[PDB]
Amino acid sequence: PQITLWQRPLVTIKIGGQLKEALLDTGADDTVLEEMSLPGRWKPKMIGGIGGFIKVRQYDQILIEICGHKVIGTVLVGPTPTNVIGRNLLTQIGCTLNF
Amino acid sequence: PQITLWQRPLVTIKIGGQLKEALLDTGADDTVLEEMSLPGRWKPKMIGGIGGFIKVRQYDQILIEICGHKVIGTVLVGPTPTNVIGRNLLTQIGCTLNF
Ligand SMILES: CC(C)(C)OC(=O)N[C@@H](Cc1ccccc1)[C@H](O)CN[C@@H](Cc1ccccc1)C(=O)N[C@@H](CCC(=O)O)C(=O)N[C@@H](Cc1ccccc1)C(N)=O
Ligand SMILES: [Cl-]
Ligand SMILES: [Cl-]
Ligand SMILES: [Cl-]
Ligand code: NA
C-alpha cells in the first residue's frame, strides 16, 4: 500500500486469530497494545510517551499479521487508548516514509 | 526521500527564525514542540498520548520549512519530551507510508 495521512493510518491487524485495529506510528520505537490475552511470560518495562511514563508488560516473540505481512517481535501491553505499531515491527514489513 | 525506520526518523525544521530537530510522527494528529518562543496569538489546548494528558499553547498559521518545503499550520508548544511533526504538517509535504 501507499497510505496518505489526511486521516489516522489505522490498519487491520491479526493476533491469535483476533482481528483488531492498530495505528501505524513512525514516532513509536516500540509496539504498545491495549489489554488482551498474549500467550507467554512477561517482564516489566517502563516507557515514555508525550504525557509521561507508564508501566507495561513486555512479551517477546509474538506473531502478528499486518496487512497480510506476518511479523514476529516484542509487544508491550499497557494503558493506551489505541493499539500502536512501532518501528520494531514496521521495519519487518519494509515500511518507509516517502515524500 | 524514501526514509527507512531502522532509526528514529529525525529531520531539521526551520521555524520562528530557529533551527530544530524533530520526529516525523505518523501516530501524532498534531505538531508539538519543546518550550520555545513563537510569534503571534495563542490559545490553550489539552493533548494526550501514552502517559496521559498535557497542556500546550496552540499557535495557528505558523510557517515551517521542512526539507525545502514551506508549509503552514498549527504548532503546539508545551512540555513534550520531544519535538514531533504530526499529520497536520506531514500531509502538506506530501508524506506517505509505503510497504
Ligand atoms: C508509543 C511509544 C512507544 C510510547 O512512543 C511514543 O509515545 N512516542 C511519541 C514520541 C515520543 C518519543 C520519545 C519520548 C516521548 C515521546 C510518539 O508521538 C507516539 N505517537 C502517538 C502514540 C499514541 C497514539 C494514539 C493514542 C495514544 C498514543 C501519540 O502520542 N500521539 C498523540 C500526539 C500529540 C497530539 O497529536 O496532539 C496524538 O495523536 N494525540 C491526539 C489523539 C489522542 C487523544 C486523546 C488521548 C490520546 C491520543 C490528541 N488530540 O491529543
Ligand atoms: Cl521486536
Ligand atoms: Cl493545521
Ligand atoms: Cl495527497
Ligand atoms: Na538507519
Q: Would you tell me how many other CB atoms lie within 10 Å of the CB of residue B60?
A: 12
Query: DSSP alpha helices (H): ranges in chain A?
Result: 87-93
- Show the ligand 1 pocket: residues with CB < 6 angstroms: A 23, 25, 27-30, 32, 47-50, 80-82, 84, 86; B 25, 27-30, 32, 47-50, 81-82, 84, 86
- Give the whole-angstrom CA distance, residue B97 versus residue B99: 7
Nearest to B52 by CA among A86, A54, A2: A54
Residue B23, chain A, CB below 8 Å: the answer is: yes
Cα angle: A69, vertex A93, B91; to 5 degrees: 110
Instruction: State how far the Cα of A42 lies from the Cα of A54, in Å rounded to an integer.
Output: 16
Give Cβ neighbours of residue B71 (< 8 Å, ≥ 6 apart). Answer: B63, B64, B65, B89, B92, B93
Please tell me the experimental approach by which this structure was elucidated: X-ray
Query: Are A96 and B99 in contact, with CB atoms under 8 Å apart?
Result: yes
SS3 B89: helix
Cβ of A97 and B96 within 8 Å?
A: yes
How many other C-beta atoms are found inside a 10 Å radius of the C-beta of residue B41? 9
Specify whether the CB–CB gap between A65 and A14 falls below 8 A: yes
- Terminal CA-CA length for chain A: 15
User: Which whole-number Å values give the CA distances from A86 to A12, A17, A25, in the listed order?
Assistant: 15, 21, 5
Q: Which of these, A63, A61, A60, A66, lies nearest to A84 by C-alpha position?
A: A66
The CATH number assigned to the domain holding B6 equals 2.40.70.10
Which of the listed residues B77, B83, B84, B97 should we mutate to test ligand 1's pocket, taking the one with most ligand atoms within 8 A of CB? Answer: B84
Residue numbers in A near B80 (CB within 8 A): 50
Spatial distance between the Cα atoms of B9 and B54, rounded to a whole number of angstroms: 23
- Give the domain extent around B46: 1-99
Q: What is the DSSP letter of B91?
A: G
Q: How many domains does chain A have?
A: 1
Number of C-beta neighbours around residue A38 at 10 A: 16
Name A64's bridge partners: A15, A71
- Rounded Cα distance, B84 and B6, in Å: 18
Burial zone of A34 (CB within 10 Å; 0-12 exposed, 13-18 middle, 19+ buried): middle
What's B68's DSSP letter?
A: T
Interchain pair B26, A27: CB under 8 A: yes
Resolution (angstroms) equals 2.0
H or E stretch at A48: strand A43-49
Q: What is the Cβ-side half-sphere exposure of residue B24, based on CA atoms within 13 angstroms?
A: 29
* Cell numbers found for residue A21: 485495529
